[PDB]
C-alpha cells in the first residue's frame, strides 16, 4: 500500500 | 536541457535467427521526464510497443523501458529513436547483436 500526502503541502 | 538520455538497444536472450525473443530499448539518466521513444524495423515504426519500468536513480534521473516481441533474422535492421529536450534532434540507435 502506498504513501499519502494527507494534504500537507510544501 | 539538464540530463541527456542514455540509450541501450538489446534483446532479452542472446539472439538466434528464427527463435522468438524480445527487443528492448532501455533509456536512462534523463531529465526532464518528457520523452518520445519509437522502435523501428527497417526504418519503419513498429506498431506494438509497450512502455514499462519507470524509476528514479535518486539522484532522481528518469529510467524507462520500451519493448516489442520479435524473431531475429539475418536481414532485418532494428533501431530505437529517442527525442528529448536535451537533444537538438531525435537520436536513432541501432541494435548491435555481436557484443
Amino acid at each position: 500500500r502506498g504513501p499519502g500526502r494527507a494534504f500537507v503541502t510544501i | 536541457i539538464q540530463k541527456t538520455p542514455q540509450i541501450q538497444v538489446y534483446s532479452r536472450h542472446p539472439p538466434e535467427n528464427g527463435k522468438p525473443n524480445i527487443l528492448n530499448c532501455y533509456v536512462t539518466q534523463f531529465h526532464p521526464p518528457h520523452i518520445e521513444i519509437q522502435m523501428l524495423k527497417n526504418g519503419k515504426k513498429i506498431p506494438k510497443v509497450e512502455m514499462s519500468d519507470m524509476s528514479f536513480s535518486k539522484d532522481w534521473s528518469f529510467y524507462i523501458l520500451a519493448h516489442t516481441e520479435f524473431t531475429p533474422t539475418e536481414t532485418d535492421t532494428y533501431a530505437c529513436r529517442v527525442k528529448h529536450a536535451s537533444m537538438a534532434e531525435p537520436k536513432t540507435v541501432y541494435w548491435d547483436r555481436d557484443m
Partner: protein, 273 residues
C-alpha cells in the same frame, strides 16, 4: 532484505491543462502497480500478476489515495513557482519517493520520504524518521512548516507500520517470483579493433535482484576510470543484465580480470579471457 518503494512524479504543462501525475510501485526490483492521470479512466492498475489477487476495495482505496495525492502536487507545483520566482509558462517537475527497506524478519532497516524539484534534492526525511534535511532556502520554508505541523510523525507511522505490513503480504503472495535469487551467468567476449588492440567485454546475464557489481582489474588495481560500464538493464523476463568493457593490448588479454559480485554468488566470480 527487501524493499517496498513508490516513485511519484508530477509534471506541469502550461497550456495543456492539468499536470500529469504518476505513481509507480515496486517490491524490490519488480514493478507491481501504476497510476497515470493521462490514462483513459485513471485508476491504480496491476503491473504484476500476483497483485491481481487483491480485491476491488484495494484498487478503489489506492486510486483514492492517488487522487488525493494528485491534488496536493498540483498545489505544490504552484507553490514552487513562488518559492523560486519562476514564470508560469514553463514546465516543472516534482518527484517524490517513499518506502521502506525491511529485513526478512520484519525489522525496518530504513524508511524514505523524500522530494526533488526540477531534478534536484528538495527535502528529505532523515534516517531518524523525525527530522528533515532541506537542500536549499526554499526547502527551509517547507521544513519549518512541516516541523510546525508535526508532519514527520504520520510519515514515520506509515514507514514503520503499513509499509512494513504490506511488504510482508506482497512477498508472501508473490513469493514464486519475488523470492528468487538468480545468480549472474557471466563471460568475457573478445573483440579485435582495427587499431590493433582489443576490447574485452565482461557480461553478466539473467540475474535477480538487480544489485550487482562488475569491475575490471589489472595487477590488483581496479580500472574504474578506464572501463565503459552500462546501466543495469531489465531483460523483460524478471531478470537483469549488465556489461563492462576495457581496451587492452593484443597478447596481454590474460592479465585482465573481471570481477562479479551478487547476492546469488557466495564467492564473487573472477573471469579471465
Amino acid at each position: 532484505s527487501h524493499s517496498l518503494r513508490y516513485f511519484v512524479t508530477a509534471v506541469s504543462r502550461p497550456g495543456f491543462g492539468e499536470p500529469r501525475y504518476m505513481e509507480v510501485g515496486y517490491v524490490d526490483n519488480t514493478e507491481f502497480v501504476r497510476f497515470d492521470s493521462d490514462a483513459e479512466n485513471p485508476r491504480y492498475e496491476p503491473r504484476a500478476r500476483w497483485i491481481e489477487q487483491e480485491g476491488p476495495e484495494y484498487w478503489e482505496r489506492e486510486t483514492r489515495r492517488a487522487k488525493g495525492n494528485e491534488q496536493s502536487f498540483r498545489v505544490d507545483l504552484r507553490t514552487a513557482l513562488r518559492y523560486y520566482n519562476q514564470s508560469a509558462g514553463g514546465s516543472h517537475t516534482l518527484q517524490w519517493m517513499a518506502g521502506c527497506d525491511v529485513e526478512s524478519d520484519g525489522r525496518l532497516l530504513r524508511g524514505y520520504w523524500q522530494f526533488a524539484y526540477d531534478g534536484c534534492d528538495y527535502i528529505a526525511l532523515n534516517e531518524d524518521l523525525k527530522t528533515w534535511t532541506a537542500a536549499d532556502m526554499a526547502a527551509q520554508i517547507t521544513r519549518r512548516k512541516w516541523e510546525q505541523a508535526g508532519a514527520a510523525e504520520r510519515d514515520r507511522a506509515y514507514l514503520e507500520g503499513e509499509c512494513v505490513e504490506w511488504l510482508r503480504r506482497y512477498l508472501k503472495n508473490g513469493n514464486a517470483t519475488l523470492l528468487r535469487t538468480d545468480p549472474p551467468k557471466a563471460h568475457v567476449t573478445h573483440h579485435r579493433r582495427p587499431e590493433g588492440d582489443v576490447t574485452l567485454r565482461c557480461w553478466a546475464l539473467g540475474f535477480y535482484p538487480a544489485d550487482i557489481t562488475l569491475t575490471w582489474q589489472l595487477n590488483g588495481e581496479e580500472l574504474t576510470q578506464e572501463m565503459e560500464l552500462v546501466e543495469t538493464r531489465p531483460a523483460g523476463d524478471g531478470t537483469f543484465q549488465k556489461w563492462a568493457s576495457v581496451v587492452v593490448p593484443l597478447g596481454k588479454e590474460q592479465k585482465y580480470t573481471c570481477h562479479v559480485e551478487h547476492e546469488g554468488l557466495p564467492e564473487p566470480l573472477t573471469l579471465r579471457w
